[PDB]
Amino acid sequence: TLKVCAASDEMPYSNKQQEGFENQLAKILADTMDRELEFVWSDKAAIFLVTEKLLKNQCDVVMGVDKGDPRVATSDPYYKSGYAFIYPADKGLDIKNWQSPALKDMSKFAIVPGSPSEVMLREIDKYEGNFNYTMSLIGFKSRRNQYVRYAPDLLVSEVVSGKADIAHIWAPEAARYVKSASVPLKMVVSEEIAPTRDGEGVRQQFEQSIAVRSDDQELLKEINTALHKADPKIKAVLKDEGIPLL
Ligand SMILES: [Br-]
């Protein structure tokens, strides 16, 4: 069997109903390895899958982490994507990158804190004026909110509604919602490394890999073999989802 650590409520990646794109990928990976797929569901956000499940031996595979994540062994990358600007189409907006003068005329930015989006918002001096807006959207832990859910469809919706001038979101998180949007949206993928005046370049594009525990080297080899074998099916799922592939 292939025991896959997965979030029970983190669309579009995963849910207990197996409707997320990584749930589909897990099925492909298990089939290709001739194993029976067994999900191990977490009630926490997917960002905790590595530390609370995988590294505690509750399951053996995490479907998506950045290549080279120090905490784990990572497979050959099975795709690369990036953070992207998301804004209404047909409004004559010229937005290609973080140096676009258009961004300077905006005030409401739908972003995820702790992401490269935050680093760049500070860089262009819009972070402070956008803080209250961002905090009205993103959930944090409290006594009343022990399981802090991540909903990127909310951020896309803010652009559709016009409450956000623009969003800057990890594209795999946003892609299906940009497609199903009720008004036409543009999704422009950021440059790989965004320049900053004083700091260093801020990476906006990331290779994604399967993760296993660092000592699970034999499993890792089987995974790499399967990934190469199933590559067309894997890429097809990702493309169907609407994910920009770099
Ligand atoms: Br950029």
Structure determined by: X-ray
Give the pair of three-digit tokens for residue 228. Answer: 């190469």
Task: Calculate how far, in angstroms, residue 84's C-alpha sits from the geometric centre of ligand 1.
Answer: 8
Protein fold of 2-79+208-241? D-Maltodextrin-Binding Protein; domain 2 (3.40.190)
**Same fold across 2-79+208-241 and 81-203:** yes
Is there a contact between 54 and 72 (Cβ–Cβ < 8 Å)?
Answer: yes
Q: How do the domains of the chain map onto residue ranges?
A: 2-79+208-241, 81-203
Task: Calculate how far, in angstroms, residue 194's C-alpha sits from the geometric centre of ligand 1.
Answer: 5
Task: Calculate how far, in angstroms, residue 189's C-alpha sits from the geometric centre of ligand 1.
Answer: 7
Decide yes or no: CATH 1.20.1070.10 for domain 81-203.
Answer: no
